[PDB]
Amino acid sequence: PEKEDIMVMDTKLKIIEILQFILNVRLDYRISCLLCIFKREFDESNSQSPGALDFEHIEEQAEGIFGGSEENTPLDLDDHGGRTFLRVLLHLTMHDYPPLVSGALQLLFRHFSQRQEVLQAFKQVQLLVTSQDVDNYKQIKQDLDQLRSIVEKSELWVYKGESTSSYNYRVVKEILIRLSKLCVQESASVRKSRKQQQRLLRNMGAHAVVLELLQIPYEKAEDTKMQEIMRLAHEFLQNFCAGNQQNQALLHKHINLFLNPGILEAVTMQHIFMNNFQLCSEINERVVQHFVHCIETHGRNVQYIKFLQTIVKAEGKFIKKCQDMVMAELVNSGEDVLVFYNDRASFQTLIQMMRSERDRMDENSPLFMYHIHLVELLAVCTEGKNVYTEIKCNSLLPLDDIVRVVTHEDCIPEVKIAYINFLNHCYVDTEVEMKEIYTSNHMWKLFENFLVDICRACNNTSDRKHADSVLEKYVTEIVMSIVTTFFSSPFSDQSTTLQTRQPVFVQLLQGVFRVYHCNWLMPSQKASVESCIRVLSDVAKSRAIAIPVDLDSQVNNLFLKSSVLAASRDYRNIIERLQDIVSALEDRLRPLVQAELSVLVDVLHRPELLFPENTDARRKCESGGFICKLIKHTKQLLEENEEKLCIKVLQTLREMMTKDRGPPLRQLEDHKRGEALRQILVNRYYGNISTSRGEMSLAEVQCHLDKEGASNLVIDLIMNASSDRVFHESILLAIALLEGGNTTIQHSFFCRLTEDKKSEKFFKVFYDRMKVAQQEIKATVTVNTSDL
Amino acid sequence: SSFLHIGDICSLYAEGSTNGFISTLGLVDDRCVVQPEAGDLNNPPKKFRDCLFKLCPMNRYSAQKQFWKAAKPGANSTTDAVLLNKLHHAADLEKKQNETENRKLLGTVIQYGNVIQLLHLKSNKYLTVNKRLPALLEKNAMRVTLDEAGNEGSWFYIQPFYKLRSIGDSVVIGDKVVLNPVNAGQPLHASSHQLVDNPGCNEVNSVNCNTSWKIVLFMKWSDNKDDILKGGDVVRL
Amino acid sequence: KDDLEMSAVITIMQPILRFLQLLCENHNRDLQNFLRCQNNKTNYNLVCETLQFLDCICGSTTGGLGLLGLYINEKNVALINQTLESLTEYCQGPCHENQNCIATHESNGIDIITALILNDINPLGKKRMDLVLELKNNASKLLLAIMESRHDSENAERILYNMRPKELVEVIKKAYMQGEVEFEDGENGEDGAASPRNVGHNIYILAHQLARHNKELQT
Amino acid sequence: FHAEQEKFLTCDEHRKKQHVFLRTTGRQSATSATSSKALWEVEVVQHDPCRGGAGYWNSLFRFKHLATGHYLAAEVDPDFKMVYSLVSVPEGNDISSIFELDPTTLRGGDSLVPRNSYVRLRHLCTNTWVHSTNIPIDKEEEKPVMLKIGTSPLKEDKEAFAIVPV
Amino acid sequence: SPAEVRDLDFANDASKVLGSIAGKLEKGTITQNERRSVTKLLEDLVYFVTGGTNSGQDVLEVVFSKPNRERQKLMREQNILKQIFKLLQAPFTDCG
């Protein structure tokens, strides 16, 4: 009925994106005015300089550029106080075109929340420091413009099967290396990240250009200049994502572009996923499995194991889910990925490769660090005292293999970390400790090698420049931990071999004390060194272990002992005053922001008032047609995958049920400011031609919403809730509607449920939503008691 | 049509890489072993009181597990005696009620997707899978043993090996099924490895596989009356 | 450091329980008999699962022997209060089917209710006694609502089987003296209706109906 | 419909010869592959040639292809260890095209056959049992779609077809 | 009685394991494994004849009451006696 032509009805949709931009540019104008306000305030502040900014003078300048002033009429689109702007959106909302009305609903959210939308945008900003900042700004501008010109001129300098192409092949490399260099600087021994240059670069948006360049198809068979260009782009991206967390989130949006079996393309992948708890909490299964499949398909590479080692342990925090998931797929990976030398025949191959690796002469290292990485990743993914990972990893590498490799004379120090610490994380640092470790003399066979290693490390006073830093780290950390965990563990005290090998314990304690005598100890490692000494002293005191008087006296002694200036100042103070002023302005808008948030529901409650009378629009709005149609729109908002809009609409509509009418001194003035702004704004929008609203009682507001179909909306949303947030909001809305024990809504729910044979989904959803809670609570509440 | 019931007595016959009746290695030992060459479904082994299992319903174990944890030497106190007495009384009541529903649930039909416990008649020990220990002969596999009282590892999902029957259907005697512990989540697997101390014996462990446990009926629950004479009984002439 | 905030799956239960209570409020007869059985192909018993949640949250028989102190912490009092309140309206008035469905359940959920009023909650009781007050008040209200003018003996003997007549009469006094102790320095129990006065009174009322099928209780 | 193989029994002409095979689908939902050449009509054998009657477990059945009009019969495998394979025959009065229904679960011999209950095609003329092979019949091509079907003299409890109501 | 057959089977199993333990004794091939496994064997017989649990004290420092009437006959019938004192002198028959 009344089939409006689609080609003419798409017109309004085409005006919608015009409205988007003409509303967006107002934000730039408002933030420019806000910057000018602070320009004036700092101009009057620094000239006098006791430095505090005039907030009581800033507030009216900020509120005079937002609304209710003579010079605020050009910001309003229709130059009529916004009275006629809302009616077009309201009229378009009743139209029968889904994306048109979907955009129309989005427009009014921006129109009412102008105060909110301005403040975050102004709080996200940045500014220039000294002439160096200006130079960097200019250089990055020209570099990006020149690069973009060539990007749109790609088909001229690309071989699809000095000249301009030859000139570009060179000139692009210098600009790419300049953009890469601007990201991170390198000191003598510390790699620091520049947090301001990266912010300027991301504000410019070089990442989009680099990603678009990477997307371009290419042939690596013949032209290696292109291959090194792509590698340089990857290097710049890695430097851009390094040292920051939000850049990694920004680049995460193009993970589907980086599912390639390439090497450096995979090198970018761990840089994207390094040191990010939140980002790794939602890792994709497919990428992780595809990396292992690439190992099984495209040879053995360390770039694929670095990603796994990074994702299993992010931010230094153990990840149980990733730890279990790694060996959930490692078992099915076959022996192609998991290669281990267990028997004597394979151990001989390991030793013959070890000798050549000790020579370090070619064709031995690539297989060498790969096995090192495999063992280290097993150790890292077996932390957390989790039974599953350790039991599954025990099969791949037992204690006997680790003992055999560590006891061999060609074991270089780097190998000792790789297997000794893995032995710790696989047997000692376990919730279910294996009693075979503490009941066997193999542990003392390992102590002997540790004693010889510590004697070697402490005897390195002949060549300081040739000292092994890795060996020092091993001595300071790994042995200390594997001894402290062993002695401090109450379960290991049941071993009867403690008093059978006193002479080796004497020399072991002597060596542990000797480690403290080293002058190369790091402050962090010194605590680890001292912890083992303290644990050994406590164990000796408790077990009455015979110790020589001299060593005991040494331990007791250790225990008992334990122009340019003004120019810098101006901008340095400016930057830190910007944060203060932003915070002050953000604080002095909350009493106002809920005013318009309530104007939302105020206008929605009475949408017919705004339009002039004796009109079809007012006739249809007076009957509740606006809310009724918005209900069926919100019914299908989730279908088109619009979750944020559906949440923001359900939460706003739930405000129809909370009837509120208006340190206590601050709250009083804030509430009065909010009421003062709300009344003037609502009266300006209304323009009805000493008045009282006389709102209808809350008892029949719920019935009025019931008659518009809000009873059906909640049930249908609950059945088809694909997300926890949508279902939670539906539950809150249903609670709000049925407040006070209304019988109309109850009868509507009953009749809908009994008249529809598809309530099975409804009740199954409710049944499962608590069955999952029961399953979780059964495993959650387990503490017993421990006495006072 | 004949259907399974609670209290039925039947054997298990694995089919696949190794085919044979599952069994034990005496009362002193507590290791489940399948013996391939000892017999077949047409030619049963000479000794046939080791392969018999009695179906039992799911039993609560929360109070029993709590009492086991309390009995662990980790908290010693003078007032702990009363708490241990209360826990022992709760466990006793829990065992008594488990026996009551065990009496009351006999004869009910068994359907796919249910939870069942296997009681070895000879050793009077339930079949259990421990989730913290690996198999003695197989490292990547999972440990399977026996226990007199049982724990949460004794619960077994019953699932169809064939697509003919789905969850909710009653189990018909003679169909190959798959056993899955509730907690271990891995089917019982008949390994092809050989025990060192016993020739021919094959270890039974818990790992993903394609082994089907063809249940073979031996005696119905109704026939299981103590006051009558029934096959397999031992008497004196 | 110390968040002490339960799983979100646990939290989502509370608005679900409140929403379920809201439909059954006002003694709307059409819903108490609907939630229990829906006359569909696969009807789910909402009352049974609501009782199961309370049974599992309290450890069932493990917590039914004076273990309320450890299970009931200062964070899940709101959830259990909402659970008890929600259970109340399922059987309010002459809702015989829900009373039968709750009292004759296969689980031991009734035991938690019965022992809730007797056993204390430490260290909650010594720190926040008021929470124990409204918890026991809601338990007493549920216990009165489960009987709710019932003539049969099966429900009465079911409640009495787990509860000997002696300790009811004992806890009547054990809920009496401290009621006067609170008044010795100012009680103000009119606004604070959770005072031990009404708490003991409700238990006395419950014993009044329970005594009709116990020849020893009236002694 | 084959329950285990998840494939539909089909009769078609290849290389100017009619063959009966078990067509292989190419998607996850094997049941949805409803083909128009997989329709078979049930003929209950009766003394009266014009009487169709009802269906019983002990009754004798004949299956006729709807589109082609050919009967389902078993004959000695030319390769011959599957001695017998299922083919199409135009003649109807022979006893070689007579089958029996064996229920998966034991049922009485005087009970009405449900429309959608799994059954086993127990051949009667040769007293063998139906069995799904795994040897494709079209060697000249590259992607096997058609698989030959034979008879197992020893009974198997996994090869039970499904009577899909049309 | 259902317990009598279990007792007979337990006694016969304890007899046959010791039969294999002492069968290789003459050749001196008994090792730690055949020593560790049989070490826990002896603890079983005493609680089998006594029918009691473990007291938690030293295994040699437990004095029991009168023994079971019937299980003493079972050990003699099932040739457990033939090996119970053969085990004690077995290590002396082993290496050395």
Ligand SMILES: O=P(O)(O)O[C@@H]1[C@H](O)[C@H](O)[C@@H](OP(=O)(O)O)[C@H](OP(=O)(O)O)[C@H]1O
């Ligand atoms: O979905 P698409 O893209 O159209 O392609 C389908 C696909 O080729 C299936 O393999 C085919 O079933 P078969 O392999 O059994 O032939 C089906 O045929 P159908 O549509 O006739 O079922 C096609 O529709």
Ligand SMILES: [Ca+2]
């Ligand atoms: Ca027998």
